[PDB]
Coordinates of C-alpha atoms in Angstrom, one line a residue:
Chain A
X243 CA 3.4 211.1 120.1
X244 CA 0.0 212.5 121.2
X245 CA -2.8 210.8 123.0
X246 CA -5.2 210.8 120.1
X247 CA -2.8 209.1 117.8
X248 CA -1.9 206.6 120.6
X249 CA -5.6 205.8 121.2
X250 CA -6.1 204.9 117.5
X251 CA -3.9 201.8 117.9
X252 CA -6.5 200.2 120.2
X253 CA -9.7 202.0 119.5
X254 CA -11.6 203.2 116.4
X255 CA -12.1 207.0 116.8
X256 CA -15.5 208.4 116.1
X257 CA -16.4 212.1 116.1
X258 CA -19.6 213.2 118.0
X259 CA -20.8 216.2 116.1
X260 CA -22.6 217.5 113.0
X261 CA -19.9 220.0 112.2
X262 CA -17.8 219.0 109.2
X263 CA -14.9 221.2 110.5
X264 CA -14.1 218.5 113.1
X265 CA -14.0 215.8 110.4
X266 CA -11.2 217.5 108.6
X267 CA -9.2 218.1 111.8
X268 CA -9.4 214.7 113.4
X269 CA -10.1 212.4 110.4
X270 CA -12.4 210.0 112.4
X271 CA -13.5 206.7 110.9
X272 CA -17.2 207.4 111.6
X273 CA -19.3 210.3 112.9
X274 CA -22.4 210.3 115.1
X275 CA -25.2 212.9 115.4
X276 CA -28.3 213.2 117.5
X277 CA -31.3 215.6 117.6
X278 CA -29.5 218.1 119.8
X279 CA -26.4 218.2 117.6
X280 CA -28.5 218.5 114.4
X281 CA -30.3 221.5 116.0
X282 CA -27.0 223.2 116.9
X283 CA -25.5 222.4 113.5
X284 CA -28.5 224.1 111.9
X285 CA -27.2 227.3 113.5
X286 CA -23.9 227.1 111.6
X287 CA -24.0 229.8 108.9
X288 CA -22.4 227.7 106.2
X289 CA -25.1 225.1 106.8
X290 CA -27.7 227.6 105.5
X291 CA -27.5 225.9 102.1
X292 CA -28.4 222.6 103.6
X293 CA -31.5 224.0 105.1
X294 CA -32.7 225.7 102.0
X295 CA -32.1 222.6 99.9
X296 CA -34.2 220.6 102.4
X297 CA -37.1 223.0 102.4
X298 CA -37.0 223.3 98.6
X299 CA -36.9 219.5 98.3
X300 CA -39.8 219.2 100.7
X301 CA -42.0 221.6 98.8
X302 CA -41.3 219.6 95.6
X303 CA -42.4 216.3 97.2
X304 CA -45.9 217.5 98.4
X305 CA -48.2 220.5 98.9
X306 CA -49.2 219.6 102.4
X307 CA -47.6 221.9 105.0
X308 CA -47.8 219.2 107.6
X309 CA -45.9 216.7 105.5
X310 CA -43.5 219.4 104.3
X311 CA -42.2 220.2 107.8
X312 CA -41.6 216.5 108.4
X313 CA -40.0 216.0 105.0
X314 CA -37.9 219.1 105.5
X315 CA -36.7 218.1 109.0
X316 CA -35.8 214.5 107.8
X317 CA -34.1 215.8 104.7
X318 CA -32.0 218.3 106.7
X319 CA -30.7 215.5 109.0
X320 CA -29.9 213.5 105.9
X321 CA -28.3 216.5 104.1
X322 CA -25.9 217.0 107.1
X323 CA -25.1 213.3 107.0
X324 CA -24.3 213.5 103.3
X325 CA -21.8 216.3 103.9
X326 CA -20.1 214.3 106.6
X327 CA -19.9 211.1 104.5
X328 CA -17.8 213.1 102.0
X329 CA -15.1 213.5 104.8
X330 CA -15.2 210.1 106.6
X331 CA -14.6 206.6 105.2
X332 CA -16.9 204.9 107.7
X333 CA -20.5 205.4 108.8
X334 CA -22.8 208.2 109.8
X335 CA -25.4 207.7 112.6
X336 CA -28.7 209.5 112.1
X337 CA -31.3 209.3 114.9
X338 CA -35.1 208.7 114.4
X339 CA -37.6 211.0 116.0
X340 CA -37.4 210.4 119.8
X341 CA -41.1 210.9 120.1
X342 CA -41.5 207.4 118.6
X343 CA -39.3 205.7 121.3
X344 CA -42.1 203.6 122.7
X345 CA -43.7 202.7 119.4
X346 CA -42.1 199.8 117.6
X347 CA -44.1 200.0 114.4
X348 CA -43.7 203.8 114.0
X349 CA -40.0 203.5 114.7
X350 CA -39.5 200.9 112.0
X351 CA -41.4 203.0 109.5
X352 CA -39.4 206.2 110.3
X353 CA -36.1 204.3 110.1
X354 CA -37.0 203.0 106.6
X355 CA -38.0 206.5 105.6
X356 CA -34.6 207.8 106.6
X357 CA -32.9 205.0 104.8
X358 CA -35.0 205.8 101.8
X359 CA -33.8 209.4 101.8
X360 CA -30.2 208.3 102.0
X361 CA -30.7 205.8 99.1
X362 CA -32.4 208.5 97.0
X363 CA -29.1 210.4 97.4
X364 CA -27.2 207.4 96.2
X365 CA -25.9 206.2 99.6
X366 CA -26.0 202.5 100.3
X367 CA -27.0 201.0 103.7
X368 CA -23.5 200.0 104.6
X369 CA -22.6 203.6 105.2
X370 CA -25.4 204.2 107.6
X371 CA -26.5 203.5 111.1
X372 CA -30.0 204.3 112.2
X373 CA -30.0 205.5 115.8
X374 CA -32.8 204.4 118.1
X375 CA -33.3 204.8 121.9
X376 CA -32.8 201.5 123.8
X377 CA -36.3 201.1 125.2
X378 CA -37.8 197.6 124.8
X379 CA -39.8 198.9 121.8
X380 CA -36.7 200.3 120.2
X381 CA -34.8 197.1 120.6
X382 CA -37.6 195.1 119.1
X383 CA -37.7 197.6 116.2
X384 CA -33.9 197.2 115.7
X385 CA -34.1 193.4 115.7
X386 CA -36.5 193.6 112.8
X387 CA -34.6 196.3 110.9
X388 CA -31.3 194.3 111.1
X389 CA -33.1 191.4 109.4
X390 CA -34.1 193.7 106.6
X391 CA -30.5 195.0 106.0
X392 CA -30.7 198.1 108.1
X393 CA -27.9 198.4 110.7
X394 CA -28.7 200.1 114.0
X395 CA -27.0 202.2 116.6
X396 CA -28.8 201.5 120.0
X397 CA -28.3 204.7 122.1
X398 CA -29.3 206.0 125.5
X399 CA -28.2 202.7 127.0
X400 CA -27.8 202.8 130.8
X401 CA -28.7 199.5 132.4
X402 CA -27.2 196.1 132.1
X403 CA -30.6 194.8 131.2
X404 CA -30.6 197.1 128.1
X405 CA -27.1 195.9 127.2
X406 CA -28.1 192.3 127.3
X407 CA -31.4 192.7 125.4
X408 CA -29.5 194.6 122.7
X409 CA -26.9 191.8 122.3
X410 CA -29.6 189.1 122.1
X411 CA -31.4 191.1 119.4
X412 CA -28.2 191.0 117.3
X413 CA -28.0 194.8 116.8
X414 CA -25.0 196.1 114.9
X415 CA -23.9 198.5 117.6
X416 CA -24.6 199.9 121.1
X417 CA -23.6 203.2 122.5
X418 CA -23.6 203.1 126.3
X419 CA -23.3 206.5 127.8
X420 CA -20.6 207.2 130.3
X421 CA -20.8 210.9 131.1
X422 CA -24.6 211.0 131.8
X423 CA -24.1 208.1 134.3
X424 CA -21.5 210.2 136.1
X425 CA -23.9 213.2 136.1
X426 CA -26.5 211.1 137.9
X427 CA -24.1 210.0 140.6
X428 CA -22.8 213.5 141.1
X429 CA -26.3 214.8 141.6
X430 CA -27.8 212.0 143.7
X431 CA -24.9 210.9 145.8
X432 CA -22.7 212.7 148.3
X433 CA -19.5 211.8 146.3
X434 CA -19.0 214.5 143.7
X435 CA -15.5 213.5 142.6
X436 CA -14.5 210.1 141.0
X437 CA -11.1 208.8 140.0
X438 CA -11.2 207.5 136.3
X439 CA -11.1 203.9 137.4
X440 CA -14.0 204.4 139.8
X441 CA -16.1 206.5 137.5
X442 CA -19.6 204.8 137.4
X443 CA -19.9 205.3 133.7
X444 CA -16.5 203.7 133.1
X445 CA -17.3 200.8 135.3
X446 CA -20.6 200.3 133.5
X447 CA -19.1 200.2 130.0
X448 CA -16.2 198.0 131.2
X449 CA -18.7 195.4 132.5
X450 CA -20.7 195.5 129.3
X451 CA -17.6 195.1 127.2
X452 CA -16.6 192.0 129.2
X453 CA -20.0 190.4 129.0
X454 CA -20.1 191.0 125.2
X455 CA -16.6 189.6 124.4
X456 CA -17.0 186.8 126.9
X457 CA -20.0 185.5 125.0
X458 CA -18.8 186.1 121.5
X459 CA -21.5 188.7 120.6
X460 CA -20.6 190.6 117.4
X461 CA -22.4 193.8 118.5
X462 CA -19.9 196.7 118.4
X463 CA -19.5 198.4 121.7
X464 CA -19.0 202.2 121.4
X465 CA -18.7 204.3 124.5
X466 CA -20.3 207.7 124.2
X467 CA -20.8 211.0 126.1
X468 CA -17.7 212.0 128.0
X469 CA -17.0 214.6 130.7
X470 CA -13.2 214.4 130.7
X471 CA -10.3 212.7 128.9
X472 CA -9.8 210.5 132.0
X473 CA -12.9 208.6 131.2
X474 CA -11.7 208.1 127.6
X475 CA -8.3 206.9 128.5
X476 CA -9.7 204.4 131.0
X477 CA -11.7 202.8 128.2
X478 CA -8.8 202.5 125.7
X479 CA -9.4 199.3 123.9
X480 CA -13.1 199.6 123.6
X481 CA -14.2 198.8 120.0
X482 CA -15.0 202.4 119.3
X483 CA -15.5 205.6 121.2
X484 CA -17.4 208.6 119.8
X485 CA -15.9 211.8 121.2
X486 CA -16.9 215.5 121.2
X487 CA -14.6 217.9 119.3
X488 CA -13.6 219.6 122.6
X489 CA -12.2 216.4 124.0
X490 CA -10.7 215.3 120.7
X491 CA -8.7 218.6 120.8
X492 CA -7.5 217.8 124.4
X493 CA -6.3 214.3 123.3
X494 CA -4.4 215.7 120.3
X495 CA -2.6 218.3 122.4
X496 CA -1.4 216.0 125.2
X497 CA 1.8 214.1 124.8
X498 CA 2.5 210.5 126.0
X499 CA 1.4 207.2 124.6
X500 CA -1.3 205.4 126.6
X501 CA -1.9 201.7 127.5
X502 CA -4.8 199.5 126.5
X503 CA -7.2 199.1 129.5
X504 CA -10.1 197.0 128.1
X505 CA -9.3 193.5 126.9
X506 CA -10.8 190.0 127.0
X507 CA -8.2 187.3 126.5
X508 CA -10.2 184.2 127.6
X509 CA -12.3 181.8 125.5
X510 CA -15.9 182.4 124.5
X511 CA -18.6 181.0 126.8
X512 CA -22.1 179.7 126.0
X513 CA -24.9 182.2 125.8
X514 CA -27.8 182.0 128.3
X515 CA -31.5 181.9 127.4
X516 CA -33.0 185.1 126.0
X517 CA -34.3 187.6 128.5
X518 CA -38.1 188.2 128.2
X519 CA -39.8 191.5 128.4
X520 CA -40.9 191.0 132.0
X521 CA -37.4 190.1 133.1
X522 CA -36.1 193.1 131.1
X523 CA -38.5 195.5 132.8
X524 CA -37.8 194.1 136.2
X525 CA -34.1 194.4 135.9
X526 CA -34.0 197.8 134.1
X527 CA -36.2 199.3 136.8
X528 CA -34.0 197.9 139.6
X529 CA -31.5 200.6 138.5
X530 CA -32.6 204.0 139.8
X531 CA -30.0 205.8 137.6
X532 CA -31.1 203.9 134.4
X533 CA -34.8 204.6 135.1
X534 CA -34.2 208.4 135.4
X535 CA -31.7 208.8 132.5
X536 CA -33.5 206.8 129.9
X537 CA -36.8 208.7 130.2
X538 CA -35.0 212.0 130.6
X539 CA -32.8 211.5 127.5
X540 CA -35.9 210.7 125.4
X541 CA -37.7 213.8 126.7
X542 CA -34.8 216.1 125.8
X543 CA -34.3 214.7 122.3
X544 CA -38.0 215.1 121.7
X545 CA -37.9 218.7 122.7
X546 CA -35.0 219.4 120.4
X547 CA -36.9 217.7 117.6
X548 CA -39.8 220.0 118.2
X549 CA -37.5 223.1 118.2
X550 CA -36.1 222.0 114.8
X551 CA -39.6 221.6 113.3
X552 CA -40.5 225.1 114.7
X553 CA -37.4 226.6 113.0
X554 CA -38.2 224.8 109.7
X555 CA -41.8 225.8 110.0
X556 CA -40.9 229.5 109.9
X557 CA -39.2 228.9 106.6
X558 CA -42.1 227.3 104.7
Chain B
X188 CA -67.7 217.9 166.8
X189 CA -64.3 216.5 165.8
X190 CA -62.7 216.5 162.3
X191 CA -62.8 212.7 161.8
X192 CA -66.6 212.6 162.5
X193 CA -67.0 215.6 160.2
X194 CA -65.0 214.0 157.4
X195 CA -67.3 211.0 157.4
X196 CA -70.2 213.0 156.1
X197 CA -68.4 213.5 152.8
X198 CA -65.8 210.7 152.6
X199 CA -65.7 207.0 153.4
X200 CA -62.9 206.6 156.0
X201 CA -60.4 203.7 155.5
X202 CA -57.6 202.7 157.9
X203 CA -54.2 202.2 156.4
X204 CA -52.6 199.5 158.7
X205 CA -52.5 195.8 159.5
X206 CA -53.0 196.5 163.2
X207 CA -56.5 195.5 164.5
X208 CA -56.2 198.0 167.4
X209 CA -56.9 200.8 165.0
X210 CA -60.0 199.1 163.6
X211 CA -61.6 199.1 167.0
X212 CA -60.6 202.8 167.7
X213 CA -61.7 204.4 164.5
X214 CA -64.3 201.9 163.1
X215 CA -63.3 202.5 159.5
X216 CA -65.4 201.0 156.6
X217 CA -62.5 199.3 154.9
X218 CA -58.8 198.7 155.7
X219 CA -55.8 198.6 153.4
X220 CA -52.5 196.8 153.8
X221 CA -49.3 196.5 151.7
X222 CA -46.0 194.5 152.0
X223 CA -44.4 197.0 154.4
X224 CA -47.4 197.1 156.8
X225 CA -47.6 193.3 156.7
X226 CA -44.0 193.1 157.7
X227 CA -44.4 195.5 160.5
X228 CA -47.6 193.8 161.7
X229 CA -45.7 190.5 161.8
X230 CA -43.6 192.2 164.6
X231 CA -46.7 192.7 166.8
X232 CA -46.5 190.1 169.7
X233 CA -50.2 189.2 169.6
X234 CA -49.9 188.4 165.9
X235 CA -47.6 185.5 166.8
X236 CA -50.6 183.1 166.6
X237 CA -51.2 184.2 163.0
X238 CA -47.7 183.4 162.0
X239 CA -47.7 180.0 163.6
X240 CA -51.0 179.1 162.0
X241 CA -49.7 180.2 158.6
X242 CA -46.5 178.0 159.0
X243 CA -48.5 175.1 160.3
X244 CA -51.0 175.4 157.5
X245 CA -48.2 175.6 154.9
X246 CA -46.5 172.5 156.1
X247 CA -49.8 170.6 155.8
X248 CA -50.2 171.7 152.2
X249 CA -46.8 170.3 150.9
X250 CA -43.4 169.0 151.9
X251 CA -41.4 171.3 149.6
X252 CA -39.6 174.0 151.6
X253 CA -39.7 176.3 148.6
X254 CA -43.5 176.1 148.3
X255 CA -43.9 176.2 152.1
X256 CA -42.3 179.6 152.4
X257 CA -44.5 181.0 149.6
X258 CA -47.6 179.3 151.1
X259 CA -46.7 180.5 154.6
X260 CA -46.1 184.1 153.4
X261 CA -49.4 184.3 151.5
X262 CA -51.3 182.6 154.3
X263 CA -50.0 185.1 156.8
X264 CA -51.1 188.1 154.7
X265 CA -54.6 186.4 154.4
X266 CA -54.7 185.6 158.1
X267 CA -54.1 189.2 159.0
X268 CA -56.8 190.2 156.6
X269 CA -59.1 187.7 158.2
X270 CA -58.6 189.3 161.6
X271 CA -59.4 192.7 160.2
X272 CA -62.5 191.5 158.4
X273 CA -64.0 190.6 161.8
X274 CA -63.8 194.3 162.8
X275 CA -64.8 196.1 159.6
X276 CA -68.0 195.9 157.6
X277 CA -66.3 196.7 154.3
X278 CA -63.3 195.4 152.4
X279 CA -59.7 194.4 153.0
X280 CA -57.0 195.2 150.5
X281 CA -54.2 192.6 150.2
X282 CA -51.3 193.2 147.8
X283 CA -49.7 190.7 145.4
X284 CA -46.0 190.1 145.4
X285 CA -44.5 193.3 144.0
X286 CA -41.8 191.3 142.2
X287 CA -44.4 190.3 139.7
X288 CA -45.3 194.0 138.8
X289 CA -44.1 193.7 135.2
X290 CA -45.6 190.3 134.5
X291 CA -49.3 190.2 133.6
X292 CA -49.6 186.4 133.6
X293 CA -47.8 185.9 136.9
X294 CA -49.8 188.7 138.6
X295 CA -53.1 187.2 137.5
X296 CA -52.1 183.8 138.8
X297 CA -50.9 185.2 142.1
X298 CA -54.1 187.2 142.5
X299 CA -56.3 184.1 142.0
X300 CA -54.1 182.3 144.5
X301 CA -54.8 184.9 147.2
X302 CA -58.5 184.9 146.3
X303 CA -58.4 181.1 146.7
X304 CA -56.9 181.4 150.2
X305 CA -59.6 183.8 151.3
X306 CA -62.3 181.6 149.8
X307 CA -60.9 178.6 151.6
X308 CA -61.5 180.5 154.8
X309 CA -65.1 181.2 153.8
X310 CA -64.7 184.8 152.6
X311 CA -66.4 185.8 149.4
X312 CA -64.9 188.0 146.7
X313 CA -67.1 191.0 147.6
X314 CA -65.1 191.5 150.8
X315 CA -61.8 191.7 149.1
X316 CA -59.7 193.9 146.9
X317 CA -56.5 192.6 145.3
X318 CA -53.9 195.2 145.3
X319 CA -51.6 195.5 142.2
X320 CA -49.0 198.2 141.1
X321 CA -50.3 200.4 138.4
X322 CA -47.7 199.5 135.7
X323 CA -49.1 198.8 132.2
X324 CA -48.8 195.1 133.0
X325 CA -50.7 195.4 136.3
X326 CA -53.5 197.3 134.7
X327 CA -53.9 194.7 131.9
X328 CA -53.9 192.0 134.7
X329 CA -56.6 194.0 136.6
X330 CA -58.8 194.3 133.5
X331 CA -58.8 190.5 133.2
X332 CA -59.4 189.9 136.9
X333 CA -62.4 192.2 137.1
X334 CA -64.0 190.3 134.2
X335 CA -63.6 187.1 136.3
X336 CA -65.2 188.6 139.4
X337 CA -62.1 189.7 141.3
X338 CA -62.1 193.4 142.3
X339 CA -58.8 195.3 142.2
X340 CA -57.2 198.1 144.0
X341 CA -54.7 199.8 141.6
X342 CA -51.9 201.3 143.8
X343 CA -48.7 203.3 143.3
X344 CA -50.6 205.5 140.9
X345 CA -48.6 208.7 140.2
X346 CA -49.1 210.0 136.6
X347 CA -52.3 211.1 134.8
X348 CA -51.5 208.5 132.2
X349 CA -51.9 205.8 134.9
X350 CA -55.1 207.3 136.1
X351 CA -56.6 207.3 132.6
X352 CA -55.5 203.7 131.7
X353 CA -57.0 202.5 135.0
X354 CA -60.4 204.1 134.4
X355 CA -60.5 202.7 130.8
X356 CA -59.7 199.2 132.1
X357 CA -62.8 199.4 134.4
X358 CA -60.9 198.6 137.6
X359 CA -62.9 198.7 140.9
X360 CA -60.7 201.3 142.6
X361 CA -57.5 203.4 142.3
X362 CA -55.4 204.7 145.1
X363 CA -53.4 207.6 143.9
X364 CA -50.6 208.6 146.4
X365 CA -50.5 212.1 147.8
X366 CA -47.6 212.1 150.3
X367 CA -45.0 210.4 148.1
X368 CA -45.7 213.0 145.4
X369 CA -45.0 215.7 148.0
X370 CA -41.8 213.9 149.0
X371 CA -40.4 214.0 145.5
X372 CA -41.1 217.8 145.1
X373 CA -39.5 218.5 148.5
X374 CA -36.4 216.6 147.5
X375 CA -36.1 217.7 143.8
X376 CA -37.3 221.3 144.0
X377 CA -36.1 224.3 145.9
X378 CA -39.6 224.8 147.5
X379 CA -39.7 222.6 150.6
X380 CA -43.0 224.0 152.0
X381 CA -46.4 223.8 150.4
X382 CA -49.8 225.2 151.4
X383 CA -52.5 222.4 151.4
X384 CA -54.1 223.8 148.3
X385 CA -50.8 223.9 146.4
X386 CA -49.5 220.5 147.6
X387 CA -48.6 218.7 144.4
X388 CA -50.2 215.4 145.7
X389 CA -53.4 217.2 146.4
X390 CA -53.5 218.9 143.0
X391 CA -52.9 215.5 141.3
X392 CA -55.7 213.7 143.1
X393 CA -58.1 216.6 142.6
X394 CA -57.4 216.6 138.8
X395 CA -57.9 212.8 138.7
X396 CA -61.2 213.1 140.7
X397 CA -62.5 215.7 138.3
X398 CA -61.6 213.7 135.2
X399 CA -63.2 210.6 136.6
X400 CA -66.6 212.2 137.7
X401 CA -66.6 214.3 134.5
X402 CA -66.7 211.2 132.4
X403 CA -69.0 209.0 134.5
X404 CA -66.3 206.5 135.4
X405 CA -67.4 204.2 138.2
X406 CA -63.9 203.5 139.5
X407 CA -63.7 204.5 143.1
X408 CA -61.1 207.2 143.8
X409 CA -59.2 206.6 147.1
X410 CA -56.5 209.0 148.1
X411 CA -53.6 207.4 150.0
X412 CA -50.3 208.1 151.7
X413 CA -50.5 211.4 153.7
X414 CA -47.9 213.5 155.4
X415 CA -50.2 215.8 157.3
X416 CA -53.9 216.4 158.0
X417 CA -53.8 219.4 155.8
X418 CA -53.6 217.2 152.7
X419 CA -56.6 215.1 154.0
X420 CA -58.8 218.1 154.7
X421 CA -58.1 219.5 151.3
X422 CA -59.4 216.3 149.7
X423 CA -62.6 216.1 151.8
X424 CA -65.3 214.8 149.4
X425 CA -63.0 212.3 147.7
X426 CA -64.9 208.9 147.4
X427 CA -62.6 207.3 150.1
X428 CA -59.4 208.1 151.9
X429 CA -57.1 205.5 153.5
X430 CA -55.4 207.1 156.5
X431 CA -52.6 205.9 158.8
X432 CA -53.5 205.6 162.5
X433 CA -51.3 208.5 163.5
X434 CA -53.3 210.9 161.3
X435 CA -56.6 209.3 162.2
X436 CA -55.7 210.2 165.8
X437 CA -55.0 213.8 164.9
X438 CA -58.3 214.1 163.1
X439 CA -60.3 212.7 166.1
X440 CA -58.6 215.1 168.5
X441 CA -59.1 218.3 166.6
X442 CA -62.4 220.2 166.9
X443 CA -64.3 222.0 164.2
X444 CA -66.4 220.8 161.3
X445 CA -64.9 220.9 157.9
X446 CA -66.2 221.8 154.4
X447 CA -66.4 219.6 151.3
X448 CA -63.6 220.5 148.9
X449 CA -63.9 218.0 146.0
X450 CA -67.1 218.0 144.0
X451 CA -68.3 217.7 140.4
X452 CA -71.7 219.2 139.8
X453 CA -71.8 219.2 136.0
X454 CA -73.1 216.7 133.6
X455 CA -71.2 213.6 132.3
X456 CA -69.2 214.1 129.1
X457 CA -68.4 211.6 126.4
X458 CA -65.4 209.4 126.9
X459 CA -62.5 209.6 124.5
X460 CA -60.9 206.7 122.6
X461 CA -58.8 204.3 124.7
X462 CA -55.1 205.1 125.3
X463 CA -52.7 202.6 123.7
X464 CA -49.6 201.2 125.3
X465 CA -47.3 203.4 123.3
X466 CA -49.3 206.6 124.3
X467 CA -49.4 205.4 127.9
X468 CA -45.6 204.9 128.0
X469 CA -45.0 208.2 126.3
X470 CA -47.2 210.2 128.7
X471 CA -46.1 208.4 131.8
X472 CA -42.5 209.0 131.1
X473 CA -43.1 212.7 130.4
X474 CA -43.6 212.9 134.2
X475 CA -40.2 212.9 136.0
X476 CA -41.8 212.4 139.4
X477 CA -44.0 209.5 138.2
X478 CA -41.0 207.8 136.5
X479 CA -39.0 207.8 139.7
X480 CA -41.7 207.0 142.2
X481 CA -43.4 204.1 140.4
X482 CA -40.1 202.2 140.0
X483 CA -39.0 203.1 143.5
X484 CA -42.3 202.0 145.2
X485 CA -42.1 198.6 143.5
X486 CA -38.4 198.2 144.5
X487 CA -39.3 198.9 148.2
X488 CA -42.3 196.6 148.3
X489 CA -40.2 193.8 146.8
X490 CA -37.5 194.2 149.4
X491 CA -40.1 194.0 152.2
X492 CA -41.6 190.9 150.6
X493 CA -38.1 189.3 150.7
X494 CA -37.6 190.3 154.3
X495 CA -40.9 188.6 155.2
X496 CA -39.9 185.4 153.4
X497 CA -36.6 185.4 155.3
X498 CA -38.4 185.7 158.6
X499 CA -40.8 182.9 157.7
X500 CA -37.9 180.9 156.4
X501 CA -36.3 180.8 159.9
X502 CA -39.5 179.3 161.2
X503 CA -39.7 176.3 158.9

């Protein structure tokens, strides 16, 4: 059989894209999107209808251009999620404005607003995951949202400190990046080539997976951002893995069953005391890679958010 | 006349070292130290007496090895400051344990402890500046300390967001780095050579100076960390400049008066509303250089702190 089919025995497959064409081809359980993918998806000709519906809907909600651009931008993200939900049995991950990453209150409000839009379309909370950056503020926002029945996807996770704080906050799911960690080491280290087993991103996720299962945490671990299938195969057994269409294609075209790599067969151990903000900040900043990548990821998603608003703006 | 003498007409000269030999040679008004300089100073043979006195004093304060190492390490930093105060009419800057940079409460306690040691030696607060890293937590700590009569030196300042938050907290002085900003651009940009006027560090300090004088802020602006005399001359007119002995030597050996570069001749403008933590975090992290350098500077000072404790440990 093919690799994709083989991987499904050990890991739940998730598609990382806003393009419905991939949902039909690989039939993933869930789908994830982010600001960059939403911007690209808005370029797809067949999605024109979704944009027009968003704009039209926005103009019917208020007569304030400022509010219309925000309403139109949020509605478009939701409209794309709605199309995807028609093709997947699981959940859709929609990300909140990255410009609010360091504002707990604003992030909670934005998250509830997105949930509201999905509910207005008849979609219940169990089919959605609100995506927030894993800053201390985002984690505190997520802890509150989960208590109110809103499940979260904590993304842009790079340091172990972030992984621990997320588990202690009881978030529904974390999406530690693998590929971006590799990118940092390739650009800031002499070693430009890594064997799958020594790939820094793979090592990071493996260690997080162990820590989570070892302590009985229920938070779903979902590896994200891949540079090659080698990273994916090395993480076979991870709860879930969200993969770009290009890599999904490679997996489905390669023959040969694979073996489970990530497993925890021991007994659950007692959980330590909760990490405080000071300890979190100290530990996170001890990681040069994590420091650079978290801030960078937030900057890029913010820029793409702005580019989308610009685009929507020229349509009002 | 020489450059050093000429610079003194426009800028207060400060020596950046823990070596008293330089105080006698250049007769600076103030002196600044940091964890790395304290560690190096501890290697100076004539300073042996200072180390023994610290250890002896520590053992007389308690019989707990853990507390003795901390007491010995803080006392040594204070003893070195005491020797310097005998040679300078101004102030001495002593830095708090960098491991507490993200802990407001712990930083306030450590600062008061150092002040206590200076007071026990008969030195009043007006001869001291407690040095803290410019993280949001350090700034909040400084705001509190200033209200209690303890003047602070906010170091490791890289972003404009940090400069603004410091001014709004009413700190006694800020020490924006110049050389480390240059280092970052040399290592992360194709351009490896900069003319004094285009040196990123110089541009940064100049902009901060303008913003401060333009709004009537009383916080002293002291440029620190230099890579060449060109950076120093380009900042002539800055309130103060703390310079390493090697560069002080170069200035005193070069002939030719210099011209004032930094000046604000307009009228004071109204101050804006205070920046919040969320806005501070957003703006600081928009600066790739600031993100890297702040965390890095804290990591290095923490390591040197540990190396000093190790050294003191083998003497108990």
